Amino acid sequence: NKFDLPKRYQGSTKSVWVEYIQLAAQYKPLNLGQGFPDYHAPKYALNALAAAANSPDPLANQYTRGFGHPRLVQALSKLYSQLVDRTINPMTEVLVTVGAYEALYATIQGHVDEGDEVIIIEPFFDCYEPMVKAAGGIPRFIPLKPNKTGGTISSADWVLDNNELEALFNEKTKMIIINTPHNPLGKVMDRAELEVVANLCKKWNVLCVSDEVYEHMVFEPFEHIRICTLPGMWERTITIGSAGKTFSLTGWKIGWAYGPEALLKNLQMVHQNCVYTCATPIQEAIAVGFETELKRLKSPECYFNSISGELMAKRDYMASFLAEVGMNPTVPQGGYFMVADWSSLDSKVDLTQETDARKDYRFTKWMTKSVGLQGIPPSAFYSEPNKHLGEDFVRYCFFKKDENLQKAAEILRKWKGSS
């Protein structure tokens, strides 16, 4: 009856996101932090939500099926069945969730017990660690590190030490979480890299959880490969996606996990007594969205195909202006984020009035308040022992109107050499 946090949440603090969203509302900077477009998503999707709101069907805005709206799961199985080349059962092998967030939540709560080890690759999407810890698991970390220095490098250059990775696998290893395309780097794992992970999972009987929200956003000449597609991997993989990312409608918060029925049963049990069901007219609108794209999967007008081309130009413009101004950027193989090492610009920043412990927090806060440009501190994506690996970096989002990417460039040009 002390109403302290229960032990499993012991020492929990507010996430980066709660802190930096609040920082954005307060200073109103050019917001290149959290990932979302600053322009309209596909009209066919927005139209479908207005249509569901306006539907003459009285069931359109009432409860739908708890493991997912029938029309959506059917659309999801149609698409992914083609992509993974097996027939995925829409009732048993798909679970619709509240964003990729709740799919990750239901997966971790579903398969992580007290003392189970979970391997996490740093830098990691930040929720992975607190979710494992809340489920009583023991995270085991391995960092990706660049094998090139100075100038602009590629996210391909950020690599695991495979001996170090092998070393982490033992009889206590329950799960490994991989994220490709990767947040924050943009790294897309190639077939050899997936093979390394898959071979260890098979040897050690571990569950692979593949966070693939950015699956449609890989840039030529690279290619998204699905690990559940590797030999023997289907039986031991759960794969996650997000309609917020697939359709660029981040405020809709609908995602999914797919995989064999045996593994999904555990997620269903968590899901059913966490939220139970997800928004009907939103899932309906997403279902129409998938139906729309399913008719044209190899067309240049298909949003799955067009987004990379849309994004690649903006990636190239930001990499250029970040290099121009003095940072060392990592050019992502997919996605809409880019990390840059800003440390060579340490003389143009006074971080003296900044209060927190981590340098990249001080840098990003200072830039927000002082110059009106918001990025995200990458040390948020590292375990405490390795936070130093992130401190010289900044993550920016380039999913923006060209006019706003130019605005960021000009802020940076003015800040630099206007000494």
Ligand X SMILES: Cc1ncc(COP(=O)(O)O)c(CN[C@@H](CCC(N)=O)C(=O)O)c1O
φ, ψ for residue 379 (rounded to 5)? -70, -15
Q: How far apart are CA 193 and CA 350, in angstroms?
A: 41
Residue 5 found at the interface with a copy of itself (CB under 8 A): yes
281 binds a copy of itself (CB under 8 A): yes
What phi-psi label fits residue 99: left (phi over 0), alpha (psi between -120 and 50 degrees) or beta? left
Determine if 34 is a binding residue for ligand X (CB under 6 A). yes
Among 29, 35, 110, 375, binds ligand X (CB under 6 A): 35
Per the CB < 8 A criterion, the answer to whether 293 and 286 are in contact is no
64 binds ligand X (CB under 6 A): no
The answer to whether 100 is a known ligand-binding residue is yes
Q: Residue 158: which residues within 8 A CB-CB, separation 6 or more?
A: 144, 145, 146, 147, 185, 187, 330
Q: Which of residues 250-269 bind ligand X (CB under 6 A)?
A: 250, 253, 255
Binding to a copy of itself (CB under 8 A): which residues in 240-259? 244, 249-253
Decide which of a copy of itself, ligand X, none touches 155; Cβ closer than 5 to 8 Å per partner kind: none
- Give the closest residue to 227 by CA, choosing from 204, 269, 195: 195
Does residue number 280 form part of the binding site for a copy of itself (CB under 8 A)?
A: yes
Asked if residues 156 and 186 have their Cβ atoms less than 8 Å apart, the reply is no
Whether the ω angle into residue 139 lies within 30 degrees of 0, i.e. cis, is no
Residue 1 annotated as lining a ligand binding site? no
**Smallest distance from the beta carbon of 45 to ligand X, in angstroms?**
15
Task: Based on the shown chain and the rule CB under 8 A, indicate whether residue 269 belongs to the binding site for a copy of itself.
Answer: yes
Task: Rule CB under 8 A: say whether 90 interacts with a copy of itself.
Answer: no
Contact call for residue 99 and ligand X (CB under 6 A): yes
**∠ CA(244), CA(226), CA(317), 5° rounding?**
55
For residue 131, give both structure tokens.
Answer: 């979710």
Question: What does the DSSP assignment read for 302-340?
Answer: SHHHHHHHHHHHHHHHHHHHHHHHT-EEEE-SBSSEEEE
Q: In this structure, which amino acid lies at residue 398?
A: F
User: x-or-dash pattern for ligand X, window 202-221, by CB under 6 A?
Assistant: ---------x-x--------
Tell me how far apart the terminal alpha carbons of the chain are, to the nearest angstrom. Answer: 57
Task: Give whichever of 280 and 368 is closer to a copy of itself, judged by the CB atom.
Answer: 280
C-alpha span between 272 and 80 (Å, rounded)? 24
Which residues from 31-70 bind a copy of itself, rule CB under 8 A? 34, 36-41, 46-47, 49-50, 53-54, 58-67, 70
303 is in an annotated binding site: no
Structure tokens that stand for 128 in this block: 């992975």
Assess 1 for contact with a copy of itself (CB under 8 A): yes
Rounded to a whole number of angstroms, the minimum distance from the CB of residue 224 to a copy of itself is 23
Q: Do the annotations mark residue 63 as ligand-binding?
A: yes
Structure tokens at 10: 């012991």
- Taking the least distance from each CB to a copy of itself, the nearer of 154 and 306 is 306
Judged by beta carbon, residue 6 or residue 417, the one nearer a copy of itself is: 6
> Binding-site residues for substrate, please?
395
Rule CB under 6 A: which residues touch ligand X?
17, 34-35, 63, 99-101, 125, 179, 183, 211, 213, 242, 244, 250, 253, 255, 276
